[PDB]
Structures are given as C-alpha cells and as structure tokens.
Amino acid sequence: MAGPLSGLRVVELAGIGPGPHAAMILGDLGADVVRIDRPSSVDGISRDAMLRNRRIVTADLKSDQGLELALKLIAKADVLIEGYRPGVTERLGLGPEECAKVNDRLIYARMTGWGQTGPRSQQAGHDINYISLNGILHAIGRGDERPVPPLNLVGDFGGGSMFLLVGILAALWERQSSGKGQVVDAAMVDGSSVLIQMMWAMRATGMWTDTRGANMLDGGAPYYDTYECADGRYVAVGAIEPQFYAAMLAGLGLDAAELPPQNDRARWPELRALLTEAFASHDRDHWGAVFANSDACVTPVLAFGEVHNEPHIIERNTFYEANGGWQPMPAPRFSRTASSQPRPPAATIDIEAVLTDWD
Amino acid sequence: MAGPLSGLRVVELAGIGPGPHAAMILGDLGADVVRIDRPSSVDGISRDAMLRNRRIVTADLKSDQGLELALKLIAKADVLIEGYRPGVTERLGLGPEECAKVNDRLIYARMTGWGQTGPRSQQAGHDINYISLNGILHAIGRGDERPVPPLNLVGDFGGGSMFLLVGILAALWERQSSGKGQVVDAAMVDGSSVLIQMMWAMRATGMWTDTRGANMLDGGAPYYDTYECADGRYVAVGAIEPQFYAAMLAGLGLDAAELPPQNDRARWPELRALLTEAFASHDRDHWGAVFANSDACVTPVLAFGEVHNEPHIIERNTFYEANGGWQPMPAPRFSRTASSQPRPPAATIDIEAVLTDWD
C-alpha cells in the first residue's frame, strides 16, 4: 500500500462526519483501514466517495459473535476509531478498558462534539451546535445579518477529524518509547477552539472585537473580502500587506492619492464604495487576467463545477476523476513515500477473510 | 515536558498563519520547539499567544554565522517547519537537500498556500485567495449576497496547519520503519480541498448544488441555520435527523401536521418563516433552558466574551486564563500522557544555549 502510513492498521466503527473523514485520510496516506458497519445498512457498493481506501465489513455488534469478531480485529490493530455518544462502546463491550485487555498497544480514538463528560455530553448535535458554544459561529457572516454557518468545515473537519488525526499520530509516536497505547479524546468543541486560537490571541491584544463583520479577516476590511464583478460573479481580495494592496490599486486603475488610507477604519465605507465601483466595471475573468502572476492577492471565486478548468489546479493534480465526479487527491504530499490515487469504495468483505489476512 | 510528543524536537523558521499554528500545536502536546526569528522583528516578550510553548532565538539567516548556527540546530532536530514561498529556503542554504546532508532523519515540512510548483506558486496570497480557487469560498454565505470569508479558519488552519501536522506526524511514523526523513509539502489549496471532501462526495451523488444558500449544510435548510430571538441574540438549529427535528418542533410549540415537510425544498422558505416567528417570540437564553438535555440540536450562539460563562465550557476546562485573556487549552486530549497548560511566550534566548541543552 502506497504512502507514509503503510503498515498502519485501523479499525473504524462506522459513524458519520468526522470519524469517517479521519479514517479516509489514514487510508489516503496508506493505512489499512477496516470499517465495521451494521448489516442493516450496505445495500450494495457505497456511492459515498468518503468511504474510499476502505475494506468494509458487516457485523451486528449487539450479538456475541459480532462482538467477538470485532474484538479479534481490534486485537490485531494499532488504532480504533469510534464516534458514538459516550457510553456506547462501553455498553457494546468495545470500550477502552475492554480493548486494553486484548491489546494494550491500541490507540483508542474517541470522536465526539461535546467530549466524554459534562452537561452536554449526551446531547445530540451537529457542527453548527459545537461551534455555536465556543464563539466561532457568532463571528461568521455580515454584520447586518444573523451568523452564517461555514458549512460543516470548522467543527466536523478542521476542529474535529483533523484533531483526531493529530491525536492518533501523536499517540503512535508516544507508543514508540512506552510500548503502550492510550485513549485520545477529540471533541469538536475543543479542537475548533484551538483552530481559532489566532482570534483568541488577537482578542487579548485589542486586535479583534466580538462585533460580527467589523474585523480585518471577517469581511469588515475592504481589502479582505469578495467583490461582485460586472457579470454577477465574484473575486476575492486578500491584500493585507501595503505593498500587495498598492499592487491591487494599480491594477484596478485607482490612484492611491484619491482614496482614504487603507487602514483608516473610519473611512472604510468610502473605500469600500470606491473598490466596489471599480471591481463592478469589468467581469471576473478580466480581473483574473489582470492579476495573474501578481502579488495583488486578487483571485477568481470559482464554483465547484469550474474548478476542474483552473490551470493551477489541473497542473498540480489537486483532483482526480472518479465515478461521475472529481474528488480531491490525498493531502499533504510526501517526497519519498508518496500516496497513490485512492481505491474507490469496494463491495463488502467477510470479517473472517480479514482476520486471516491480518494473521 | 508533558504530552505525547515529549522528546520531539522541532525547528520553526518564523512566519505567519499556518506554520506558527502547527508549531504551536506541536508545542502544546509536549514537543521541544525552537523558533528562529530575525533580530529586526523581536523586541520585548511576544504578546502573541500563538507563540506559546516555544523557545525563541534570533539569527540573520542571510549571514554566514546565522546559517551555520541554524544548520547546527537542524542537525539535532527531528522536524523543520518553514512557510516561505518556494525557493526561499533553498537560496538561504536551508533547502531540503542541504538539510539532508547534516541530518538524513529530518522531517522537512513546507507550508504554502499554492504548493511547491505551478503557475501560482510564486504569487502572494492569504486564506481568502486559496479557498477562492477550489470552490470553497463560493459555497459560503447567503444566496442573495456575495460570499463571505469564514475568517481564516478553512485555508490557514483547517486545510493548512492541520494538514502540515498530519504530514509531520505521519512522516515520523514512516521514519520508524525506514530510518529516514523526507519532505512534507502541505499546500492550503490541497488540504482545504480534502477538508471539504464531503461536499465533493455529495456533489457526485446529486445531493449538493453549486447554488449558494440552497443546500443542507450551507444555511439554506431551515433546520440547519441560525435564528434571531426576541432579544436580538441567536440560536443555532442543527436538527437534521427527523427525530431530532420532531423534538425541536415540540419544544417550539409547533404541530408538525401544520408545517410543510422537513425536506420539501420547494417549501423551505415557507417553513423558514414559521420557524422564524416561533424563535422570535422568546429570547436566546429561554431557548437555551427549554432545550437543555434535549436532542433537538438547538444551542445558544455565544459571542467570544460569553464563552467563559457556559457550564459545559467551564467544567471541561476547554480554556485557561492567560496574560491578556482566555486561551484554548491543548487539543485533543490524552488519557496517559496528558498535555499541560501552555507555557507563555518567554523572552529571547541565545542560540548557543539551545545547542548546549541539545548537543
């Protein structure tokens, strides 16, 4: 199996959102990932590209046979991933303490939103809930409107699966001294809070306020925002540094002497009005040309369906084609032990066949 | 030094955004992290909490002595992090090949937005630019408005630092088998694409559209969005699963029989209006009480300044008091080798000291 995690063995108790995303990435980087789903489920080969780089197996974990086979897989593996509510694996007989009895090398990775304990620890939730409690959601969107969810990128993935991954891999490094596994407790409410550490840093030094839409990086700054062009499509401007901002102004045709200072916040309304009228005067693809190879920090805001036509995307093979759609190639990239193209979802395998393989 | 990464040595070439965030998380988990800044920028003790769990040293990397001292660190280290444009470390004489001469075990980690090669590889940029090219930014915000940046959470951190960490720690695992380092190439345009793999998966199966504000998780669904309350504050609703949705309706006082179907998208505007009126008739904290211990997936949207007073946050110690204010405690969490509270940024030390300390 190609990639730096060749030889790493992972058991994933099938759930939704962060658990499978983390499992995907371990698979992507060469891990041997076996996913146990319920029989009531799997009516064919999966159509869900997120289940790439998997072997799927079926097993009623409520039955004693189910549990036994499961504990035999875990015995032969380096990592377990579960993202059920706290208590669920315990009650199945697949809890950490049970796992520690058949494999004290196990990295026992627990993916939740609220964490393992505390008042919300049994409440159902999704991304939007976890980021609502720690200040993140409130910071996202225009100042004249209610907050807008940043899809499920910040709680589920950035602050969720990715922290689970770092935990697993950090724990494997620990396991190199100690010869012992341990439990990784990844909660979206915690990981997302470390994800936004910069805002907490800036808040402390007076460089970030709680007012939505009134900061340097939330859309409040005219030089860090999107602009509507003549065709109704958009560009993004990120020209924070003064030298990049000056480069942007020259490409737009605006003389710096006729504008308010870049960082005179009291005159941001005027500045925005000027930049707005300028970008509105030509179409997105015009601005893409003007600013290609410039440091002006102006880029076209492409829709998903146009991404496959962008030269920089094509040339670095950020994406590959698979069963009626582009999908992203593994990230990040490795010079010597490169990942390979992901293996698509495969039909279910037998749990005995797998135990054989793992010897 | 507490945490799973005790004994890991990291040299960080000072930069902005994702590199410092990665180095911070490594530090948080107990890595020994030495950050080389330039003499010209360091003054007092840094007031940037992102620089916690560091030793800071200065050095003109353009001098003969600075280059030498730096190469002697890297000789003794496990990982190097740099986040300059491609070619920059090569020209300083700190490129991968030069480092491979003095330490074939080094994990050489390169954090960029656009990657190591390709047409955009020398273009200045910020988060908003990287996420504009791969479809992410276009998908964020309300449908009748221009896209809104989700701060710098998705390119810099979620698809940036976190992928640099996954690559560093995966490469360390590969090293245990191979005896050798390698180069990790973490590009924000790639990582953020993998971060949003769920949308590409959903797009392939006809369950995600390129129309902004018309999807299950972008704010277009009335059961996955924020709602303004009687007091002008907000709740988040995340009631995707029909059973949680039913529980929310009961708590709102709304008879399901009176309402359009949860997932009849043609009638979402109509459903939204009914839910809007309901949420508007009481204040945020009222809804917080009503739905505590519920699976209705309704949570108060707290501003940063309110987070310190939420019971669930307090009791799990998601934050600690610092210097200027509250900061996120390390994530994720480890049962056996737990992280300690971060060490605040401490004054510049002398590079020779570190070399003594390390050899």
Ligand SMILES: CC(=O)SCCNC(=O)CCNC(=O)[C@H](O)C(C)(C)COP(=O)(O)OP(=O)(O)OC[C@H]1O[C@@H](n2cnc3c(N)ncnc32)[C@H](O)[C@@H]1OP(=O)(O)O
């Ligand atoms: C993309 C998205 O929408 S992402 C979801 C975001 N949330 C999270 O993942 C955080 C994790 N915590 C949670 O909130 C939950 O996982 C939820 C809310 C997503 C699901 O809630 P629930 O449906 O109550 O599931 P919960 O995790 O509590 O339990 C799963 C059940 O399946 C059972 N189960 C698991 N695997 C199997 C199996 N192979 N065969 C049979 N039963 C099984 C468990 O034993 C449990 O039954 P029980 O609780 O009645 O004893």
Ligand SMILES: CC(=O)SCCNC(=O)CCNC(=O)[C@H](O)C(C)(C)COP(=O)(O)OP(=O)(O)OC[C@H]1O[C@@H](n2cnc3c(N)ncnc32)[C@H](O)[C@@H]1OP(=O)(O)O
């Ligand atoms: C918070 C935010 O907004 S963060 C996200 C920003 N984006 C990225 O990080 C992507 C990757 N990095 C970059 O694209 C760039 O570093 C930018 C766009 C951020 C800034 O561009 P530049 O200012 O041109 O920096 P670049 O990386 O090209 O080079 C930095 C210079 O610092 C110099 N330098 C670095 N360390 C030292 C030192 N200790 N002493 C002296 N000089 C030093 C380098 O030698 C280089 O000099 P040179 O090109 O003049 O030979």
